Amino acid sequence: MKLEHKNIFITGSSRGIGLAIAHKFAQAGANIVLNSRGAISEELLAEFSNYGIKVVPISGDVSDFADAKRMIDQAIAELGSVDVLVNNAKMTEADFEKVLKVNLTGAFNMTQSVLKPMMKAREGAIINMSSVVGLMGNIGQANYAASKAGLIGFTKSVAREVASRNIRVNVIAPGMIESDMTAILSDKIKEATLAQIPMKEFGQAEQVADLTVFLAGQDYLTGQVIAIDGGLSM
Amino acid sequence: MKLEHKNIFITGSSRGIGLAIAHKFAQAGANIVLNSRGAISEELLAEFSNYGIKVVPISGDVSDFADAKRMIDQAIAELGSVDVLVNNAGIKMTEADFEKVLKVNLTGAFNMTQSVLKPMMKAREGAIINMSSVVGLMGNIGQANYAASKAGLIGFTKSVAREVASRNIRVNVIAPGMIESDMTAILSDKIKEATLAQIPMKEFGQAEQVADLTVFLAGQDYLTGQVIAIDGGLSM
Amino acid sequence: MKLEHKNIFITGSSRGIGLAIAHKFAQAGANIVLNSRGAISEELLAEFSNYGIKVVPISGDVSDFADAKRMIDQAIAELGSVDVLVNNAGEADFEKVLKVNLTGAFNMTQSVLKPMMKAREGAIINMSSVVGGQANYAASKAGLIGFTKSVAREVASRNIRVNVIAPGMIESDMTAILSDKIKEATLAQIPMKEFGQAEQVADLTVFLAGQDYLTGQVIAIDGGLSM
Amino acid sequence: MKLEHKNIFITGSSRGIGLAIAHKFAQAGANIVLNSRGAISEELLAEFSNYGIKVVPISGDVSDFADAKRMIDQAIAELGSVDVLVNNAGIKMTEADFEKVLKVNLTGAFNMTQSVLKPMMKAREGAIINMSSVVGLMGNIGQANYAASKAGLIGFTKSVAREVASRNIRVNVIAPGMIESDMTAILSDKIKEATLAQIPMKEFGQAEQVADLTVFLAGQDYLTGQVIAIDGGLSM
């Protein structure tokens, strides 16, 4: 009931967890922006034409400051507003570092872009999300932890500045999620991976979606970091 | 859906936020244990009659280890299991009554947790939610004692969560802020505008919002060891 | 020597970990209180008489608040003061011992704080019990950790350091005499593939007692067991 | 003595905390590698000639993996082995390259750790001590970058500790707080008093406390994967 007819911008929502988040927001009656760095296909656009909600495809590069502002502006012109922004996010360590920086920059830019309209409406929610945890070497673990800390400090800073304007700003930290590849991995490497999760199991994408939609509709909750990772980041 | 027919032991649930928590869980279809240091009235039980669940009163002293064990067993007997424990214990007063209420929250959280962990670890399932005490009007000495007790409840919760994760038990802390109470409508505007000025979001919480978070956490698998303030940014 | 003539009250110091801690403190030149539920044997006192320190025996029940205060008062009466408190924690029997140990740490900590707070200094070192399941083991170790953080917060502004040591599996008589296939399966569970030694716990306890500006820490000495 | 004749490689030990650490290791009878980006002055080597230990100057760039590898090989060839690696860091001017010294120090821990792990794993013995930088007075962007690089150093340390525990190698991080230094008298009474009031023990730390903790960890067996804050309770 709290989310019906609200307008949700979900970055990276053509695949994976972002798509699960978008299905869950749609099941709650909210209007949906589907967003990808690539194109949104008519396939995907049709999965969402059974909920009786407005669905809008908006592609672009969140990591380009002006293009992030363009994407927020398009959503406002097509839906009327953005009530909720969900900032959902290689092989060498150097390329892995670059990917983390791109996703962090994208979260920064989209957050900066919606602040002005949300602050006018005295209304809105921003949910920043660290990336799903994969297998990483020592240096990848370090780079992962550094960029996650960066996202948390930024998000807490923004939470403090916009509280008096009734904008709620929170971070969700997923852990290791099952995928179709999990079935394919060796029982050896699963066992050494599970060993590092206190709850000794992998997460599911739908758990992240449930938490995301719950936070979106939950007044009076701001500045929080909520890990949903079976204890991984304890 | 995910809480329907689950069994919820809610301590200190005869009034206030505890009682609001009990109502949300009943609205989710969970059976509930209403608990108080003293007797539970027939008119309080009457409030839950249209929910189509089981409601059990168990009164006792959560801060007495023997009676904490007694109350958990009695809840298992009458309901079948304890799937969720919500520790919300403790109820003008001076600083000494304030320390005592803080120590009751901790002791009761400790004892009720230790008791319920015996069946939950054998069943390999369960959720425990520790509630810090609602934040009221506090001076110098008061905030110091509050901060130390909260550090204790958080440290306790994170440590327990570490210890029991391998047996599939989730343990989290909720930290309510300044919550609107039946009292609040009769406070004076000077004291109200002066405490609102301390809250980043410039408003008071609702008991129902604390209840919503409590019920959500209880059903949310794979979330453990978290501290979630619901306080309009007071603790930021 | 940061510890010569400091006054160390060491609960449960007649055997095992507590005895090893008492020896390390005595080796650093500190005065020590040897404590146990029963009487301190004459032998034990004599095993400490050539360190050149004051050795004070004080028997009693830590899990009884009035006796806890009697014991601290007695130690303050016999030594200068109590500069360092070490709260050492060695079926339904298992539950009663954990309860005595956790209550003991609470009672002795409360009794020793007023003198330390007035002095602007002190150190309290809590000990969780060694590993090797129970609800009670989990809750009690967590209880001690939560109490330690609460007290560290409470007393930091008076320059009093409060820390917990969490030992892992320690070799003992009990370890040494069991199946060599159970030890194999047991050591396999420890990332450093070996058992700890009481003397390692003792070195850590002495270091924290003497180390300024370190408080509120939970330090596992467990071969990575809890990483 | 547990450190007598052990071979200690201390990065950034020509001045500040790193130098203090070197002196504490020499007082424990350990052989020392003094290291800096520039060349080690003969006057600094003279401070150590009196200890009856062996003292070896090795300069280079820790943030260059090839030169990191070579520095380690040089130390093995002049001392026999590296038993303990201390990845030391630390610092008036800009925000532009506060980030630069953080990243250089951080990647330095990366390369030196990666380089010494081969001979320690073969030797089946060893210790690695990483150290976050001293907490100083920082703008908001400073604190943001400080928190990120510290989080990165901790994740690196925990990951390596897991990797090498089975080959008897101990890996830990020290997290200093605010160290009283030359920037302490200059600061105004409003500034010290307000800063001191944010530290729970209400006082500034000393470099010697960090050096003492470093020496203790180097010699303490069976202790690995720990993050040890010596910061007056700042991060409790």
Numbering used by the authors:
A (entry chain A): 1 to 89, 99 to 243
B (entry chain B), D (entry chain D): 1 to 91, 99 to 243
C (entry chain C): 1 to 90, 102 to 143, 149 to 243
What does the paper say about this structure?
One critical component of FAS II system is 3-oxoacyl-[acyl-carrier-protein] reductase (FabG), which plays a vital role in the elongation process necessary for the production of both saturated and unsaturated fatty acids, utilizing NADPH to catalyze the initial reduction step, facilitating the conversion of 3-oxoacyl-ACP to 3-hydroxyacyl-ACP intermediates. Recent research has identified fabG of S. pneumoniae as an essential gene through CRISPRi assay, indicating that SpFabG may be a promising target for the development of anti-S. pneumoniae agents. The strains carrying plasmids producing either functional FabGs or the yeast OAR1 exhibited the same growth as the wild-type strains. These demonstrated that SpFabG has the capability to complement both E. coli and yeast in vivo, thereby functioning as 3-oxoacyl-[acyl-carrier-protein] reductase FabG. When SpFabG amino acid sequence was investigated through multiple sequence alignment, there is a conserved NADPH binding site along with the Ser-Tyr-Lys active triad responsible for substrate catalyzation.
We have determined the crystal structure of SpFabG at 2 Å resolution using AlphaFold predicted monomer as template for molecular replacement, shows casing its similarity to the overall fold of the E. coli FabG. In the asymmetric unit of the crystal form, there is a single tetramer. Despite the slight differences in the flexible region among the monomers, this analysis primarily focuses on the structure of the most stable monomer, chain A. Overall, the protein conforms to a Rossmann fold, with its core comprising a twisted, parallel β sheet consisting of seven β strands flanked on both sides by a total of eight α helices. The active-site residues (Ser140, Tyr153, and Lys157) are clustered near the loop connecting β5 and α5. The conformation observed in the crystal structure is considered to be inactive conformation, with the Ser140-containing β5-α5 loop occupying the pocket where the nicotinamide part of the ligand should be. In three out of the four monomers in the asymmetric unit, this loop is stabilized by a crystal contact, and the electron density clearly reveals both the conformation of the loop and the active triad. Phe223 in the α8 interface plays a crucial role by facilitating a π- π stacking and attracting the relevant side chains towards each other, and Ala236 in the β7 interface interacts with Gln233 in β7′ by forming a hydrogen bond. It is noteworthy that the hydrophobic side chain of Tyr229 inserts into a hydrophobic pocket on the neighboring side, resembling a key inserting a lock. The interface B, locates between helices α4, α5 and their respective counterparts in the neighboring monomer (α4′, α5′), constitutes a four-helix bundle.
